[PDB]
Amino acid sequence: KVLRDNIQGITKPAIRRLARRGGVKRISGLIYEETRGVLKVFLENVIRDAVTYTEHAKRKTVTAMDVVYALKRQGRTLYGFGG
Amino acid sequence: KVLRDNIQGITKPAIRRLARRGGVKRISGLIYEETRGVLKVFLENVIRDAVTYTEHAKRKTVTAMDVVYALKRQGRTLYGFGG
Amino acid sequence: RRKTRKESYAIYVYKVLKQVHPDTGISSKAMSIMNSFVNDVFERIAGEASRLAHYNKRSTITSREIQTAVRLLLPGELAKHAVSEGTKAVTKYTSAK
Amino acid sequence: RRKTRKESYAIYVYKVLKQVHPDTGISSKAMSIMNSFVNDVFERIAGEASRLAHYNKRSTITSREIQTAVRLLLPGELAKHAVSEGTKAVTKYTSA
Amino acid sequence: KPHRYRPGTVALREIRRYQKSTELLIRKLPFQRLVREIAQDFKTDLRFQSSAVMALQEASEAYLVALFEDTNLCAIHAKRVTIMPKDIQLARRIRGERA
Amino acid sequence: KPHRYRPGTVALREIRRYQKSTELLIRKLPFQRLVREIAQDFKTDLRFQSSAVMALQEASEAYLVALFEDTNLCAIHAKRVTIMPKDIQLARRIRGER
Amino acid sequence: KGPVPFSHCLPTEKLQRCEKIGEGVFGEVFQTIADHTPVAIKIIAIEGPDLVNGSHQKTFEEILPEIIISKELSLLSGEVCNRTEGFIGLNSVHCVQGSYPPLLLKAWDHYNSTKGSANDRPDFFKDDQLFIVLEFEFGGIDLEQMRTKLSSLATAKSILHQLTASLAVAEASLRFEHRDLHWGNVLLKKTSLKKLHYTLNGKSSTIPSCGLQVSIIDYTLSRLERDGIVVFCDVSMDEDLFTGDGDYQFDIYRLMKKENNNRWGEYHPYSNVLWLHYLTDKMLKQMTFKTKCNTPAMKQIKRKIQEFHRTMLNFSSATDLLCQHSLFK
Amino acid sequence: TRSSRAGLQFPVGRVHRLLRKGNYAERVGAGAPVYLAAVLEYLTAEILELAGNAARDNKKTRIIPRHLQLAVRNDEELNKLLGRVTIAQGGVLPNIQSVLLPK
Amino acid sequence: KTRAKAKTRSSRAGLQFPVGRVHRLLRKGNYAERVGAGAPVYLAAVLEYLTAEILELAGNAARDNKKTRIIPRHLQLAVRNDEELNKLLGRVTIAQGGVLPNIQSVLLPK
DNA sequence: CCGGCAATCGATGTATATATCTGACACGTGCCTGGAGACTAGGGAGTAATCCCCTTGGCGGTTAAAACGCGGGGGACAGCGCGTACGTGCGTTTAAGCGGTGCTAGAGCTGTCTACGACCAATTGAGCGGCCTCGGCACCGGGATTCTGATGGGCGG
DNA sequence: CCGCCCATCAGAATCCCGGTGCCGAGGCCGCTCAATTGGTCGTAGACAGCTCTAGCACCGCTTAAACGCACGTACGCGCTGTCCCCCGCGTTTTAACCGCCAAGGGGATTACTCCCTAGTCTCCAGGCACGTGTCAGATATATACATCGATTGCCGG
């Protein structure tokens, strides 16, 4: 479709900020590609589960409840949204 | 009668055999104490859970199904011993 | 038109907070987090009790199952105080029923 | 007093094994392992279906819940073939 | 000659600054575009609620921060200061996510 | 002129041998004594079935083997061929066990 | 006849209960408690050829139009054909001889040390100087000091509704013109009347007060006519006021200089709507409300207020706005 | 009311109703809701007290999710209980390795 | 006749796993208030398919080792050598199973 | 005239072929309890119609963040030498393993009967949802303060 | 003659107040319906008694494994030198964010059938416990076969 190559929107300074919050002092020049890959895999899994959940209910809109249920099924509980 | 000093029964050759099955070629001289501590902690947790399970049922004998239930609760499902 | 009502634990959480800290407020997001925490703990304990009742071939849930589930699910220091509080509440309820 | 009776899945597993490999046997420990495997998978699928039914405010379990639970639990190609099998079975049961 | 800090000071300042705040560290529109693009593969003409995207962002950021912490530990274990892809691979292998 | 093998050959032979069989590698009586001694701190005058002891032994051996595999990976990562306690500590920390 | 002493109207006990409020070229307005009721004493020097606050004092006959207008507007509240309770009613009026009591000077000193005063000291007045003492009801505090504790725009809609009703009633009664309306002349007070009642040209109507009563002060330059006799203070010579700049009031002043071609003896009710326009500009750019605009009902209310502010100028008088405009129908 | 006889603040009838129609068991005893309500109230009180202490430390009179995260992560038992839980708008605990510090 | 001959539901569905037993287990398991009429057939079909796959792989592994009987070692070899099966049974321990032979290349002699 | 590279040579542990012997596995039989056939009552689920809230799309301004270039200092990486901790083998000591013998504490099953939980009808007060105030809380702007990093200036064995 | 210490200077980091903008408590009504009170009634489980399986204790004899010691070498660790490659700072270009405004698509609510599932009674066939052989695998013996470590034997600069 029209939406393509949006993985490049995760800029290098954003990854640097995440690393700084994680507590990293020096970063090599080949980390951004690996970070993009792992983020893509994680998002793919979560979104697939959420879309299955929204498909079972005969709806056309993905809600926060579906995301929460998918995350809980994956083993990562999330507090603050619905519940 | 009361038992004491039985952690020394896990001899050094047994730990060496377990390491060899794990795929290790050389072993330092201070691994045995750490291995004994880890084994003690693991056994303590499992045995505590099993004893609680057997105490709820108003029994005086620990059965295999109690151990299986404790292992499943811990997240280490085991196949073969019934259940 | 009035929407369908929704149940939560806000009132009781606020009552407990006023009991502990008489001059402290709370924000909406914190209240939502507390609601989620209460629901999660309730579900865990209820599921453990149901499994315990099923293991022993019984068809009823009593306070013994709840006590054993609390003993299994919580660490020791929290478990002791929770057991004491539950036993005291049950004794007080039964005495003046 | 009279001894109680115990139920298992040994005969069905033996029938399937004779269907797949008509000249192979099995031991007792392997039978126990297969029994445990079947019980575990049954429990997983049933629990997932029950949760799905409770989420949508329903009071019955149908084949849709089982299909969705199978899709959610089984990974990759293992799901696809499995789903097909189930569908076929239901259709046959409707014919008779 | 203009003032210049030594390499390593501003990094520590940023480490101390970003460990006290709570706001998100990724822009919203690019993340929304990425989420929609990924989701278009499973079903055509989908719609989203704002809370769903917000929750996805929160979960992703938490996961990435934890992974970076583990990677830093792995890099320190090997007598080094910089983090390299081998550390990420080892952390993911031990965690059990990768085969 | 006695015959002597170089350091490393017998280790590889043992690695190959112990990765092919399936028996238990710990003596049974000391393990049973240790299990009873540990259990006596939670209740007094307890009795066990042999199946319980066998299940505990199997689970313990599997856990130890997996831990040793992870330790070997960590030791290899740091340009070494000898395992050290720091490798075990790092593996346990990353796995999530305190 | 003859002036009365200070103890005749403001004795010592109600002299010590006192607090200062306001000052000006004419005199000073000042708070006290009398008859178990908070009242305002307004003191103007008269018959004094002495330079005070940059100018000398006029005679009693110059003040006479002001008191005429004051008691006429007070009786307007007691009128049957056109009744409105949103105005200020007098208590009495008297003449005082002597010098300023020391308590007044000490209150002025406290006010200057706390709030600051741009007027001269009142202590040079002689013991034979003549003053006029006037009594007002306590109408509350001014709109200027109250600008940052208002609840929501509903209170606005209410206070505009009430002031427009009051001006329309006054126009229908005696053809009254104020010709001065700044956001420091509106007094609001807390009342328990949820729904207030009034009469316009013989028809009964009501205003939702939102638990708030309003008033506006008397005007020294206000113009009206009774039975063909016109009461108005000529302002054609004080062009300094209309040549100012810095905010909208001077713009309104030049508009009221231009629309009536300096013939102020006639009646021009149109400039009142621009006076209200000034207040609308103030409310949309000079006040803070305590309620967020998230709810769409009050959002559309605000948009309606905005289009009123934009489109009011095509009417002819406040009565037209009251009887035709969408916010008022 | 049942909750008043037990001296509790959490509801007892609501807990009983939620237990009775959640597909847990065929029958539910008359003592389980009281025990469950007491346990839930105790845990809530403990967490709230810790969070309020953390909030008062930071010179504020209201509790926000940062305070809840600080209270939970600084206690061993609560941290062990919520070992796989993520709180929105939480942040992380300040911690820097000693090797990275300047000489 | 008053009644016809009894026909099992499995025969009508053309399966080998029991359908009535699965229906009874679903009903007396505290899962939902009611149980439909098509769920047991689906569950039985899925379970039979999975069992057949595992048994096929295990039998091949046993035939490789020159034996005519399946033992837990063969089951472990079958499970650990397939990606999907290994992912499904990722946290399960099989008694008397063993490990997959594997040595790191660095440890090998030059 | 050596440091090497290949080619043997001996020794050791592992894989392979053949004959006996056993106990675990593959069927046969009887019986009973759980599943199938037939029928009825009612309520959970499917469908159609309607309302309106939330999602998608568009436009303009401003400005904070991303992108690019460059000099240089500190860190990654390879090479080398030294010392001792760990691997391999031999002789001697220890306790696991196996085969019986005996005893009894406790798991498992059955029959009675009483109390505790399910269900129903009439009453009513707790809890939630609209509309409205508002007193203080968090927020920013300024200024001041402080504290830390990067620097040059020296006495000395 | 190699320095390793001290006193100054700049620039972030944090404190104090003053003025603004909203939010989380509170109040009212108005319900709605879910919880409380007072009864009946059928059965789940507590309790007592009995049977007998398996868990525990002891003893004797073999042989394999654990233990202690000697010796040598390969691996871990510290030191030095070189070069690339990220870090800090300045300038210019891109699009994110905020505010506002319509359009309508689909989620949520109400009313009305009606077909699918629970419950009951009767009957018999599938599956489980028990009992018997016989052959796949375990054991013992002998026999090659691949591989490791040392020695020889020429060989080109």
UniProtKB/TrEMBL annotation, chain H:
It is found in: Chromosome; Nucleus. Residues 1-73 form the Core Histone H2A/H2B/H3 domain. One of its GO terms (molecular function) is DNA binding. The keyword Acetylation applies. Residues 76-103 form the Histone H2A C-terminal domain. One of its GO terms (cellular component) is nucleosome. GO terms for biological process: heterochromatin formation. Keywords: Acetylation, Chromosome, DNA-binding, Isopeptide bond, Nucleosome core, Nucleus, Phosphoprotein, Ubl conjugation. Core component of nucleosome. Nucleosomes wrap and compact DNA into chromatin, limiting DNA accessibility to the cellular machineries which require DNA as a template. Histones thereby play a central role in transcription regulation, DNA repair, DNA replication and chromosomal stability. DNA accessibility is regulated via a complex set of post-translational modifications of histones, also called histone code, and nucleosome remodeling. Belongs to the histone H2A family. The nucleosome is a histone octamer containing two molecules each of H2A, H2B, H3 and H4 assembled in one H3-H4 heterotetramer and two H2A-H2B heterodimers. The octamer wraps approximately 147 bp of DNA. This is Histone H2A. It comes from Xenopus laevis. The lineage of its organism: Eukaryota, Metazoa, Chordata, Craniata, Vertebrata. The chain holds residues 17 to 119 of 130 of the full protein.
Automatic annotation (TrEMBL), chain I:
Residues 83-110 form the Histone H2A C-terminal domain. The nucleosome is a histone octamer containing two molecules each of H2A, H2B, H3 and H4 assembled in one H3-H4 heterotetramer and two H2A-H2B heterodimers. The octamer wraps approximately 147 bp of DNA. Residues 1-80 form the Core Histone H2A/H2B/H3 domain. It is found in: Chromosome; Nucleus. Core component of nucleosome. Nucleosomes wrap and compact DNA into chromatin, limiting DNA accessibility to the cellular machineries which require DNA as a template. Histones thereby play a central role in transcription regulation, DNA repair, DNA replication and chromosomal stability. DNA accessibility is regulated via a complex set of post-translational modifications of histones, also called histone code, and nucleosome remodeling. GO terms for biological process: heterochromatin formation. Transmembrane segments: none annotated. It comes from the Eukaryota. One of its GO terms (molecular function) is DNA binding. This is Histone H2A. It comes from Xenopus laevis. The chain holds residues 10 to 119 of 130 of the full protein. Belongs to the histone H2A family. The keyword Aminoacyl-tRNA synthetase does not apply. Keywords: Acetylation, Chromosome, DNA-binding, Isopeptide bond, Nucleosome core, Nucleus, Phosphoprotein, Ubl conjugation. GO terms for cellular component: nucleosome; nucleus. The keyword Phosphoprotein applies. Residues 1-10 have a biased composition (Basic residues). Its main location: nucleus.
